[PDB]
Amino acid sequence: TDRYSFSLTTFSPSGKLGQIDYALTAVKQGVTSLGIKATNGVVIATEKKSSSPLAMSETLSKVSLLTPDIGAVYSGMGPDYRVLVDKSRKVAHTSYKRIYGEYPPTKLLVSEVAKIMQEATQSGGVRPFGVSLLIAGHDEFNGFSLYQVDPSGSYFPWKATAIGKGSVAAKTFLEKRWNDELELEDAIHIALLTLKESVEGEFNGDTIELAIIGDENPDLLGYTGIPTDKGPRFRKLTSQEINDRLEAL
Amino acid sequence: GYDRHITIFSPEGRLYQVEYAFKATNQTNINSLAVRGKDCTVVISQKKVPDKLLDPTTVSYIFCISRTIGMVVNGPIPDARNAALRAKAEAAEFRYKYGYDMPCDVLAKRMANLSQIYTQRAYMRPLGVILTFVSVDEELGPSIYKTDPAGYYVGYKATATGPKQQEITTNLENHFKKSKIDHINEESWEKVVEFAITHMIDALGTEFSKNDLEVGVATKDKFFTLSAENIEERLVAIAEQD
Amino acid sequence: GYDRALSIFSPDGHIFQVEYALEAVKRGTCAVGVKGKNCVVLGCERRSKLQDTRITPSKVSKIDSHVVLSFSGLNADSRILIEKARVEAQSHRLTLEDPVTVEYLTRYVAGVQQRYTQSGGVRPFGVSTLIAGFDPRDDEPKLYQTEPSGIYSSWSAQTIGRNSKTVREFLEKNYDRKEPPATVEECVKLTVRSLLEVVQTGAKNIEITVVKPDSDIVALSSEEINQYVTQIEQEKQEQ
Amino acid sequence: QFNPYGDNGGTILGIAGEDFAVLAGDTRNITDYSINSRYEPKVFDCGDNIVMSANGFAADGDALVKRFKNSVKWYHFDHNDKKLSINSAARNIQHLLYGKRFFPYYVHTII
Amino acid sequence: GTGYDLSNSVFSPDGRNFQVEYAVKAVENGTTSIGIKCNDGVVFAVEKLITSKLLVPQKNVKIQVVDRHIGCVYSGLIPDGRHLVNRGREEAASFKKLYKTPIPIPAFADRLGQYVQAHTLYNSVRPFGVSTIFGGVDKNGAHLYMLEPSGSYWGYKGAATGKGRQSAKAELEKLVDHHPEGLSAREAVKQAAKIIYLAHEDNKEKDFELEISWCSLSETNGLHKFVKGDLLQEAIDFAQKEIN
Amino acid sequence: MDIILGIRVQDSVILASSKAVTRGISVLKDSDDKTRQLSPHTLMSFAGEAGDTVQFAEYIQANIQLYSIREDYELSPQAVSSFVRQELAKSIRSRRPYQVNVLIGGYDKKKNKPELYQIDYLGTKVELPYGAHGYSGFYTFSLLDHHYRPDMTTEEGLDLLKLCVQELEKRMPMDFKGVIVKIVDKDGIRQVDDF
Amino acid sequence: YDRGVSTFSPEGRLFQVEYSLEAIKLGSTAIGIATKEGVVLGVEKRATSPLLESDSIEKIVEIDRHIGCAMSGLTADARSMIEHARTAAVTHNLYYDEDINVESLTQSVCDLALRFGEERLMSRPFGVALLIAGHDADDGYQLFHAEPSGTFYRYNAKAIGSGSEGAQAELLNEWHSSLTLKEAELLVLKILKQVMEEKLDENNAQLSCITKQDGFKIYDNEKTAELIKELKEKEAAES
Amino acid sequence: RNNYDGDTVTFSPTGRLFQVEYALEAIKQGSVTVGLRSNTHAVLVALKRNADELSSYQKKIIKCDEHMGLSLAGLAPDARVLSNYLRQQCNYSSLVFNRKLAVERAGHLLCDKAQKNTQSYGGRPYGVGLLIIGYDKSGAHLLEFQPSGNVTELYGTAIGARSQGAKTYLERTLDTFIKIDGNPDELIKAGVEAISQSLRDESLTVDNLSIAIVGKDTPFTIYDGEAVAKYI
Amino acid sequence: GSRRYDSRTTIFSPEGRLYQVEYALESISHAGTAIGIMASDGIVLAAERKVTSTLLEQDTSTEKLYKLNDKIAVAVAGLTADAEILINTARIHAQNYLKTYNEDIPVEILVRRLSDIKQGYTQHGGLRPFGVSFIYAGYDDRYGYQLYTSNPSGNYTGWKAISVGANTSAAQTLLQMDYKDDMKVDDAIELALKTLSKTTDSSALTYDRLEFATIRKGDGEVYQKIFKPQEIKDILVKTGITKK
């Protein structure tokens, strides 16, 4: 019987929530993942650290499409991120598409994921999620946006930010290199330059996972006939494209 | 001190129960490797029958989940049988609801999500087992996918699990660096079984009889387990090899 | 789901949660009730600035047109008790075609608190209550006190909250059972004196509500309480 | 459509005397125009010097008699083998019957 | 850290569940019970301690039956054994209701194993304090299984648990080595009587009553039946001769 | 066969309810008061199935009084009519719907305005200068359409209601044993003694 | 909080049961004497202040017209027990058209005492002991002591509460089988005056009787004062 | 030991269940009751214990059906719960199958009822021990039930304080009382002597002795008060 | 079992306080300071952002001031996620009241509903309380303009000028110093800005580190304006705290 009907996250006498801070500590020890918002798209990149080289690198996707216009990356505990991505994909339909006929905007999906995580930090017999999420999305009425979601259930909009081990150092780079006139290719280049310092092993398209929320891809719709339905804005960059952009650094 | 009894975060941001379940996976002191061929997948596991009163035919850590998916477990046999029953039920439910056989990676992801649930829920303990599913997916070819008590799941060109896992892993890495391919370029599955057994002999440095190994072979739309006589015939063919 | 026994017995025969709720009552604002010959008066302390007295809730709350309830302790639990009492008063009006008696309402609130002391997964109420009023067709005043333990008792005059021992002793020394305060003015004066014995801040932190038969409940404005405090301070000049 | 009830005929009769009572019943059980049994008693001794007969639908009557005998048994269990007075048995049978007020026993009862 | 043995289903830093091992300790303190898988069936035997001669002999049966073909004996907390037997009876009833055929011995073994393993999964439930030797005859022949408090079960040529488990196991190993061809049903019954008499030496303070049952295709038509009457006395005499 | 009429006359609302309660071929009562005072400035007359009427009326009354006690504030007649309409619109799709029709007359002190709402058992609410429930409407509405003036006085409203009751007593095939008449204005609710 | 509420002691006892008994020991005194002319129940109205109206101290309640009850200890916990007893009595009257036996009523009340733990039960056992007096046609006049342990005894006379121990001693010395009703009343009054910390008057002591003729009746202050005066006269006429 | 007596869900390092043992100790501190049987009858003798001279003597023997009854030693409410369960099971057997519940099956069902509490978190073991006598198609039966769940069929036994003396008395008198067939009074007097063998500074009175008899052509009957005088 | 890990969040202290309530208050004491002021013709809410950085998008950012309906807003101090949960429940309750009575819900009713939710979380269920303090600024046709405050304990009080979060003592002192009853909305804006600039922990009070909102009457209806970063910068350079 599930007799753990009490909160496992409680306020300490100092006011801190122990499990929240410990999940944040687990996040800080995760691999660095960053995101940069440009004027014509957003970029999210991370290091695809593989344990054994016998492992299939494609079967370790750290960036996951939530909606055709909204993707997400993480830093922290992989499995928590995976179950959160599943819950997010499900709530994007059960709470918006099946009610309004359209996919949710970035802020609403981010708020739903934050609500899930907050429930995970207060419900009975559950630990908080050990992940921080970077969600990059585009909707028609709010344009492009990038959000950070913490285990505490709080989310913040960012022009650019990194999370993980060397995130602080990476953030400094972004603070020195970000401007409100950036292009999507310039944002990808800055993301590559920022991730180059956060990694120590090989720095190629097989060790980096990068995705973009940019223009619509009508070639990725799978069907042609409805001119109103454009293509998906989320696109994961292939290893060949990553290497082609790395050769010009 | 209670942070090391239930699946909650320690001050260092770790889950000690998950690490102790990982430790318990090696309680059986049995190693197992898995490799992919041109059109098949072979798993080899150690068969240790310490008691003379035991029925050797019942001592098994390989399970036929479906007609296409097999699973070898590293860990105690109670949790092994629990995971095996759950995987068989999930495969049956998948085939019923979606009208096609459950893919290997999908079953691995389902079991890994259940493991993540056990990792985030405090009412139940993580299963101290590491599950290696193998199949010949109709869209992916030979496939090996492993899941661990932490909720992680990933595919492999080849893999190993057990106390001597690092040695077998390094041996397979060296062979694949030499061959410069991601599988075993052999047409027949018997030669792939022979290769796997041979490389396990090389890694562990100990010889095996027909009653010391368990072999599971997955080909297109059929997973089976070799008998002692087929294992012995493969061992004879390995002894003939120079 | 959560059903852990929070209120249990101690080796010395004590229910520590009920005693701690009584302690929380001891930290609450002061609240006194005095019975007259034809009226009841409830006085309350408004602690210590920049507070909007227009919209802030008063300690004295109307349960029904004829019965009122003041409290001492955690206001948040007092709100729940007041709402349950009002709902039960309306239900009793609906089913019995007769407004609740003061004793019935007091017993209902006391039973709710006793349930909270005996139920699993719940803590007792950190609220002690003073219920005052007149029966639907009776001119005799009724003043009852209820505790977090669930005990309810009638009182000719009784105070609860911080420094309630001093006010209770002052009342024991100044309240005569042979002759209760005849007029409403005498009862209000006794109440405000008993309060000023502890508040020591003035009429700004004193609330007075007088209930009279046939549903005549009047809350005195700051001007009436100021009149009372000035009268008693002028009577205090004697030495 | 399935009819849950049936008619089993029979007739019972109770007469109270000065220091005695008599409850009689025909031992004929029938269904439509056939004889089910030529000897099937329907007046039963329920203990505590109380005889009972529920005539009509034989299944409902048997169920009622069994429930009342179990009731007197548990009355002895829960009250130190106190004798069931005839008025107490009558009210207990009223409650047993009204328990199925919307699915009644198709029987006429006499104790 | 410490205190890992205070709650069930708590992994210790060495990868162990100490509550299961404590249940195993509780099992080891119980009487001796053995099982022998022969060519055409299986035989179960158990020792019953006669603490006083006020106990009615031939009563207080310890060997239980599941369905009409499964025999189960257990060492440890007898009530936990009865609980496990009731669970297995429910499983066999559902299996027969759904799949018509009587439940196979491996299926029953896996059902009981899943039940015990689930009982070692939560801190709100206590592990079973019994080790169960069960078996019987199905469409695939004779089967004998032993199931531990951990939920771990295996198929055995011979099984034994209790105080005299060591001696009984040694004797069973002798029976396995000396007779590779296999024992018959009545021969296995007599040998089980002998093994129980030899295992009683670890609890010589009290006297014991031997209880034997068997499920064999040739002698009992595949049904589990208690060895009673002449055969019981024959096995007792064989054991008393093997002693002195 | 219940007479529930109401008329709004500039300064007040006048509600008339038949006095007859008949079960079968027997007039059990000839002095029944088919109204419930929801608030000092809001009255509600009701008509419908036996039992459902009084149950619904007293339930709504208890809820309105509970709100008034909790908030120390009298709900506007519009909010009360909305609450009653919500309850009646939940009733129809319940297990046993309340077969009650209500006429709510109230003087809004905020707007200093008289208001009359008509709601049926289905939850159809309408704000009307004059309203009627049942077959009585078939005789009164057109009559009111000819004689009603928005600038009428409470006494003129009483005369108009007298005319309506006379027409009903003439042409209706049932003896409703007269009407009880009540006036709701800024000074509260009062009852006309002889009508 | 380190053990469960349903946890046995190494001596073979329930911790919460013994703790509730210790709690009852701190409660007011309740004495009962069963004779052949009726059963007498006397309790002490322990007043914590002269302002408390002693009329509202209801520690003697009526279960049914032929069964009365006295409570000692946490008297708030006894409200649910008394309600259950009254409903059980009237429900037995409804099902069987007769009066429920006193032993049956006591057993039905005791069936709730051990219904606690962590189907949602109570969190703790009761903190109140009961003396249930009654008359039935089977066993005549009966007096039962009911503990929160679910166990109940029958007593020819029984004292519970503060100072009950020594009181029981006196109850052993002065009770005989041929004792009468008035003798039982005087004995209860004497033992109550002995075990009280105040001067025994009609305002700190309450009496009640169960007789076959008039049922259960609680004595008004007039009869109590008369009996107290008679007891004083009797005790003054000794050596 | 210290950290292993918190509940029934915790095993000791030696494999013990200390809460079950504490229930057993609760039984050992209960008043003594003896039971015996022959081939035709079965007797339960009960030493009812009082608090003082004004108290009653708590009844220790409970009837479950016209052919089966039990005597208790320990917690009275737990004995009432188990006796109610046994009455319900006998009633279910008689109603659904027109079959008197055997004594062995009743013992098995009480074993299951007791085991269901010694393994789930929350609750406690039963604090009573039972001696169940019965007469069924197999003859006379006496069962001893402990809260551990173990129910044992015996010719005679005794439970409660100082019960070892009565147990040794029945051990010595087995060959005598097992042959008391056709005469229930001699079996009752043997049981009374047995319960007297366990009276340290105590004596049997007409208010403290309880007798129960069931056998061939003898429904389960309880004798209290004057009825036991003939056996004192 | 599981009671070993239960912290018992809803229990009293020997002094008569709730541990988790006091600790949540201590937590809120580290949150960004929020200030509400009720002038003669409006209400003003101002708050400081704790999460402040150059790369933080402040346009689409909302972490201190939220809308409940068209006439009520809330300033939050504490856990933003718990605040958003309570704000969602409050919006749903306001729309329920609107559907039921076809009138806008009064401010005190919504405040009492939310405070009762926060109280019930501290009495049963065994869950941690919401580490959130709320400043409610609203208008209705019964009490006019209203400023309320609620804490995790479930208590709510009405104010003329109040502050929650960090440095509440100095902020309340400054407010009591510089508050007057007859002041207008612009004077209240000035007072809130001065109090935030004098009680802040940062170097200077900049536009990108504040959220601002005003509920006023300017038509005949009340307008609720959440200030944009440019409007905050303009009001800052107007009051003199910054220059351009």
- Chain B residues within an 8 Å CB radius of E179: none
Task: Indicate the burial class of I53 (C-beta count within 10 angstroms; 0-12, 13-18, 19 or more).
Answer: middle
Structurally, chain B folds into a number of domains equal to 1
Measured at the CA of I56, the angle between CA I52 and CA I57, to 5 degrees, comes to 130
Q: How is residue E10 annotated by DSSP?
A: -
> In sequence order, which residues have a C-beta less than 8 Å from that of residue I25 and are 6 or more positions away?
A15, I133, I151, I152, I153
Structurally, chain G folds into a number of domains equal to 1
In chain H, the N- to C-terminal Cα span, in Å, equals 45
- CB contact under 8 Å between A80 and B123, yes or no, is no
Q: Which of D74, D77, D78, D82 to mutate to test the interface with G (most CBs of G within 10 A)?
A: D82
Task: Indicate the burial class of G34 (C-beta count within 10 angstroms; 0-12, 13-18, 19 or more).
Answer: buried
CB A205 within 8 A of CB A36: no
Q: Which of F38, F60, F67, F71 to mutate to test the interface with I (most CBs of I within 10 A)?
A: F71
- With an 8 Å Cβ cutoff, is I141 touching chain F? yes
Task: Indicate the burial class of H156 (C-beta count within 10 angstroms; 0-12, 13-18, 19 or more).
Answer: buried
- Phi/psi of residue I100, each to 5°? -75, -50
- With an 8 Å Cβ cutoff, is A5 touching chain C? yes
Neighbours of I231 (CB within 10 A): 14
In Å, how far is A52's CA from the nearest CA of chain I? 36
CB E26 within 8 A of CB H16: yes
Kindly report the three-state secondary structure assignment for every residue of A155-202. Answer: EEEECEEEECCCHHHHHHHHHHHCCCCCCHHHHHHHHHHHHHHHCCCC
> Measuring CA to CA, which residue among A119, A124, A46, A49 is closest to residue A84?
A119
Q: How is residue E71 annotated by DSSP?
A: E
The CATH code belonging to domain I1-242 is: 3.60.20.10
Count chain C–chain F contacts defined by CB atoms under 8 A. 22
* Amino acid at residue number A37: K
Catalytic residue, chosen from E2, E31, E51, E120, is E31
List helix spans (H) across D4-105.
58-78, 86-98
Q: If residue A76 lies in a helix (H) or strand (E), which one and from where to where?
A: strand A70-76
CB I55 within 8 A of CB A161: yes
Q: Report the residue of chain G nearest H51, measured CA to CA.
A: G153
Superfamily of domain E1-244: Aminohydrolase, N-terminal nucleophile (Ntn) domain (3.60.20.10)
Taking the domains of chain E in order of start, what are their residue ranges? Answer: 1-244
Per-position DSSP letters for chain I, written without gaps between them: --GGG---TT-B-TTS-BHHHHHHHHHHTTSPPEEEEE-SSEEEEEEE-SS--TTB--TT--SSEEESSSSEEEEEEE-HHHHHHHHHHHHHHHHHHHHHHSSPPPHHHHHHHHHHHHHHTTTBTT-----EEEEEEEEETTTEEEEEEE-TTS-EEEESEEEESSSHHHHHHHHHHH--TT--HHHHHHHHHHHHHHH-SSSS--GGGEEEEEEE----S-EEEEPPHHHHHHHHHHHTSS--
In Å, how far is G236's CA from the nearest CA of chain D? 47
CA dihedral I131, I135, I141, I145 (to 10 degrees): 170
- CB contact under 8 Å between F69 and C83, yes or no, is no
How many Å apart are CA E150 and CA D29, to the nearest integer?
A: 62
Neighbours of chain B (3+ CB pairs under 8 A): A, E, I
> Measuring CA to CA, which residue among C127, C112, C106 is closest to residue C20?
C127
- With an 8 Å Cβ cutoff, is H21 touching chain I? no
Query: Method used for this model?
Result: X-ray
The token pair at C119 is 């139920």
Q: CATH code at G57?
A: 3.60.20.10
- With an 8 Å Cβ cutoff, is I12 touching chain B? no
Residue at token pair 């910068």? I233
CB A104 within 8 A of CB A140: no
Task: Indicate the burial class of I199 (C-beta count within 10 angstroms; 0-12, 13-18, 19 or more).
Answer: buried
How many Å apart are CA A74 and CA A167, to the nearest integer?
A: 12
The token pair at E88 is 């297995």
The CATH code belonging to domain A1-248 is: 3.60.20.10
List helix spans (H) across chain C.
16-27, 75-96, 102-118, 164-174, 184-199, 222-236
Q: Which of F73, F82, F83 sits opposite I142 (nearest CB)?
A: F73
Distance of CA I7 to the CA centre of its chain: 29
Positive/negative CA dihedral, A164, A165, A168, A173: negative
Long-range contacts of C110-113 (CB under 8 A, 24+ apart): C110/C146, C110/C147, C110/C150, C110/C151, C110/C152, C110/G76, C110/G79, C111/C150, C111/G79, C111/G80, C112/C81, C112/C84, C113/C81, C113/C146, C113/C147, C113/C148, C113/C149, C113/C150, C113/G76
User: CA distances (Å), G77 to each of C18, C114, G125, G160, in order?
Assistant: 13, 7, 9, 16
- Chain F residues within an 8 Å CB radius of C63: 69
Domain C1-238 CATH assignment equals 3.40.50.300: no
Length of chain I: 244
- CB contact under 8 Å between E53 and H174, yes or no, is yes
Task: Indicate the burial class of B59 (C-beta count within 10 angstroms; 0-12, 13-18, 19 or more).
Answer: middle
- With an 8 Å Cβ cutoff, is I80 touching chain A? yes
Show the domain range for G125: 2-238
- Chain E residues within an 8 Å CB radius of A3: 124
Q: Report the residue of chain H nearest D63, measured CA to CA.
A: H95
What angle, rounded to 10 degrees, do the helices at G78-96 and D86-98 form? 100
Neighbours of chain F (3+ CB pairs under 8 A): C, I
- With an 8 Å Cβ cutoff, is I4 touching chain B? yes
CB D84 within 8 A of CB D50: yes
Per-position DSSP letters for G30-60, written without gaps between them: EEEEE-SS-EEEEEE---SSTTB-GGG---E
* Amino acid at residue number A223: Y
> In sequence order, which residues have a C-beta less than 8 Å from that of residue F79 and are 6 or more positions away?
I101, I102, I103
CB B161 within 8 A of CB B146: yes
Residue at token pair 């000692």? G72
Bridge partners for E208 per DSSP? E49
- With an 8 Å Cβ cutoff, is G121 touching chain H? no
In Å, how far is F74's CA from the nearest CA of chain C? 14
> Could you give the maximum distance between any two Cα atoms of chain G, in Å?
62
The token pair at C196 is 């000023």
In Å, how far is E154's CA from the nearest CA of chain B? 6
How many Å apart are CA I90 and CA I134, to the nearest integer?
A: 12
Neighbours of H85 (CB within 10 A): 16
Taking the domains of chain I in order of start, what are their residue ranges? Answer: 1-242
CB B16 within 8 A of CB A127: no
| Contacts with E, I 142-171, CB within 8 Å | none
- Chain B residues within an 8 Å CB radius of I4: 2, 5
The token pair at C202 is 């003035």
Q: If residue E108 lies in a helix (H) or strand (E), which one and from where to where?
A: helix E105-119
CB H73 within 8 A of CB H128: yes
In Å, how far is I85's CA from the nearest CA of chain H? 34
Per residue in B78-94, is it b (16+ CB within 10 Å) or e — as a string?
Answer: bbbbbbbbbbbebbeeb
How many Å apart are CA C97 and CA C79, to the nearest integer?
A: 26
- Can you tell me whether residue F105 is helix, strand or coil? strand
Length of chain G: 239
The token pair at I80 is 């933003």
Measured at the CA of D71, the angle between CA D66 and CA D75, to 5 degrees, comes to 150
- Can you tell me whether residue E157 is helix, strand or coil? coil
In Å, how far is C177's CA from the nearest CA of chain G? 8
Residue at token pair 């001893």? H144
Bridge partners for C31 per DSSP? C44, C160
Active site residue E31: yes
- With an 8 Å Cβ cutoff, is E118 touching chain I? no
> Measuring CA to CA, which residue among F9, F14, F6 is closest to residue F113?
F9
CB G106 within 8 A of CB G146: yes
- With an 8 Å Cβ cutoff, is D83 touching chain G? no
Bridge partners for A70 per DSSP? A67, A137
How many Å apart are CA E177 and CA E159, to the nearest integer?
A: 15
User: CA distances (Å), A246 to each of A48, A58, A205, A241, in order?
Assistant: 16, 19, 8, 8
Bridge partners for H135 per DSSP? H140
Q: Which of C109, C117, C118 to mutate to test the interface with G (most CBs of G within 10 A)?
A: C118
- Phi/psi of residue C60, each to 5°? -80, 120
Q: If residue H80 lies in a helix (H) or strand (E), which one and from where to where?
A: helix H76-97
> In sequence order, which residues have a C-beta less than 8 Å from that of residue I231 and are 6 or more positions away?
I212
Fold of H2-232: Glutamine Phosphoribosylpyrophosphate, subunit 1, domain 1 (3.60.20)
Long-range contacts of C164-173 (CB under 8 A, 24+ apart): C164/C26, C164/C30, C164/C32, C164/C72, C166/C197, C166/C198, C167/C30, C167/C32, C167/C194, C167/C195, C167/C197, C167/C198, C168/G49, C168/G51, C170/C194, C170/C197, C171/C32, C171/C34, C171/G51, C172/G49, C172/G50, C172/G51
Could you give the domains of chain F?
1-195 (3.60.20.10)
Task: Indicate the burial class of B159 (C-beta count within 10 angstroms; 0-12, 13-18, 19 or more).
Answer: buried
> Measuring CA to CA, which residue among A147, A140, A76 is closest to residue A109?
A147
The token pair at F139 is 């005789």
- CB contact under 8 Å between G4 and I8, yes or no, is no
